Design a protein around this ligand. Structure first.
Ligand code: HEM
Ligand code: LSN
Ligand code: LSN
Ligand code: LSN
Ligand code: K
Length: 463
């Protein structure tokens, strides 16, 4: 049988009982009644929730292959999203993911490293920040340009000037779609309608925005097909075309210009908003806890100095800053329920039997805010990742990127972006708040499955 859960109602299941304001809090409430594994019904669609480290670990890690599916919902069909990496399944997923991970290794695309691309972007970021001339600033836009440009550089090999209008169009389309996708109407309510789409104009805008991006990618790809040097692949496209070559004699192949376009859009989608938000939240928490910022700066001064860019090598000698980055991630809990999973076959879990294809919802919040691993999990405190001697203290509960076979492809990349961008900023600036560090609230603003920071402004004061 399935795991227990609140008795669903006829037809609507458990829908009218789950506080949609903050699904994560609701799942936690439920776990207080039904335990670490329970079922909920969306219509007659069951969804098994895993809550707590032990349950998430055995599912995602111990029974990893069985829980490597991506749970699909009507929205997947409606915004054409099952044809790259994030929303794919089976062989298509495995091959594209595998290829993607290899291509994204630090030196996976030629002599120019991922680190180098990030470092260059950090340089540009500091520059654009300087241009604010220390005036009040809503850093949303600037912080979003950086991670986006890193993807551009990884995919097209070229970064854009922050005012190159083709760059500005890309970001606009991305931002638009993200905002749309973040509406509870689109995340929740539209998914009740199994066969009929109630927001047709919206799904049309989404697709239109994608079309524009794919059509920009297509042009870059033609240019790349032209100046193809087989022995010197320089970006994700070069690599993807070279994989295509090895595939000839392997029809049909998972690698096609279509899947390339789709994969590249996924990278843009997955690689630019979460990192960008996490950067934005970090500055806010640093404004709120200036003593933390000061220590990060003391480590930057001592280990890196002022005569050179930060680099990944410096991280191991900067336990405190490392602890800070980790803590930001843990505290903010950006993807409280990760992305939905689905079992790939009939499976026995604990004392229950979960049928193949059943949707699985993982509570990352439950792990990240584990009250024993992280006393006072609701408070921001770098000491959560530090030992008595001030050394960095790793945690099995550090899962902001999820865990298992579906773990974030960008785990390493995001790590580099956070560390390098944050160190760079604080190497060249002090942060000044408009209001008083005692007044601003840093509590995340939850809306359905989304969790973001509140609005704020600051001044980047050159050192
Ligand atoms: C702070 C930044 C980021 C966070 C917190 C984050 C977190 C996550 C999470 C929670 C998932 C869901 C995994 C699951 O299904 O269990 C995910 C998926 C993914 N992330 Fe990210 N991510 C970040 C940045 C990036 C970046 C920069 C990339 C760029 C390569 C990226 C690429 C992906 C991809 C491709 C997936 C889909 C994985 C799959 O289905 O196999 N992410 N990420
Ligand atoms: C009918 C095909 C038009 C598609 C489209 N492309 C762009 Cl671009 C626009 C700008 O609104 N649009 C139209 C659009 C119209 C209404 C919405 C919308 C906004 C808020 C709340 C509900 C809707 C909605 N979508 N579908 N029906 N109502 C979204 C996009
Ligand atoms: C020009 C188009 C902008 C981005 C874009 N809009 C559409 Cl629609 C797609 C297909 O999902 N995408 C690609 C997309 C791929 C993955 C995600 C995703 C990746 C990791 C974690 C959460 C997200 C997510 N899914 N929905 N909203 N944000 C977001 C966007
Ligand atoms: C194909 C899309 C499936 C997503 C979905 N539809 C419904 Cl209905 C459910 C939960 O009843 N869910 C679970 C879910 C929905 C959206 C997200 C999401 C979308 C954009 C940005 C962040 C998130 C996120 N993932 N986990 N928490 N928040 C995450 C989980
Ligand atoms: K309409």
């Amino acid at each position: 049988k399935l795991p227990p859960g609140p008795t669903p109602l006829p037809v609507i299941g458990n829908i009218l009982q789950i506080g949609i304001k903050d699904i994560s809090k609701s799942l936690t409430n439920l776990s207080k009644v039904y335990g670490p594994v329970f079922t909920l019904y969306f219509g007659l669609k069951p969804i098994v929730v895993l809550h707590g480290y032990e349950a998430v670990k055995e599912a995602l890690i111990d029974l990893g292959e069985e829980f490597s599916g991506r749970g699909i919902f009507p929205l997947a069909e409606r915004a054409n999203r099952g044809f790259g990496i994030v929303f794919s399944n089976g062989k298509k997923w495995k091959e594209i993911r595998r290829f993607s991970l290899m291509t994204l290794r630090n030196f996976g695309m030629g002599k120019r490293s991922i680190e180098d691309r990030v470092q260059e972007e950090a340089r540009c970021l500091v520059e654009e920040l300087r241009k604010t001339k220390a005036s009040p600033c809503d850093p949303t836009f600037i912080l979003g340009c950086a991670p986006c440009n890193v993807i551009c550089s990884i995919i097209f090999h070229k970064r854009f000037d922050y005012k190159d209008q083709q760059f500005l169009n890309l970001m606009e389309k991305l931002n638009e779609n993200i905002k749309i996708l973040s509406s509870p109407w689109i995340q929740i309510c539209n998914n009740f309608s199994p066969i009929i789409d109630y927001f047709p104009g919206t799904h049309n805008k989404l697709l239109k925005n994608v079309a524009f991006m794919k059509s920009y990618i297509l042009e870059k790809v033609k240019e790349h097909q032209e100046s193809m040097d087989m022995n010197n692949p320089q970006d994700f496209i070069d690599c993807f075309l070279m994989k295509m070559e090895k595939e000839k004699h392997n029809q049909p192949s998972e690698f096609t210009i279509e899947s390339l376009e789709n994969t590249a859009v996924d990278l843009f989608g997955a690689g630019t908003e979460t990192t960008s938000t996490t950067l934005r939240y970090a500055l806010l928490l640093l404004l709120k806890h200036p003593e933390v910022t000061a220590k990060v700066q003391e480590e930057i001064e001592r280990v890196i100095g002022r005569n050179r860019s930060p680099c990944m090598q410096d991280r191991s000698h900067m336990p405190y800053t490392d602890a800070v980055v980790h803590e930001v991630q843990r505290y903010i809990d950006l993807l409280p329920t990760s992305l939905p999973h689905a079992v790939t076959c009939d499976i026995k879990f604990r004392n229950y039997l979960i049928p193949k294809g059943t949707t699985i919802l993982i509570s990352l919040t439950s792990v990240l805010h584990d009250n024993k691993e992280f006393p006072n999990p609701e408070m921001f405190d770098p000491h959560h990742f530090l030992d008595e001697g001030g050394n960095f203290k790793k945690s099995k509960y550090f899962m902001p990127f999820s865990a298992g076979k579906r773990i974030c492809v960008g785990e390493a990349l995001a790590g580099m972006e956070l560390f390098l961008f944050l160190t760079s900023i604080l190497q060249n600036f002090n942060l000044k708040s408009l209001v008083d560090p005692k007044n601003l609230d840093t509590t995340p603003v939850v809306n359905g499955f989304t969790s973001v920071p509140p609005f704020y402004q600051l001044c980047f004061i050159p050192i």
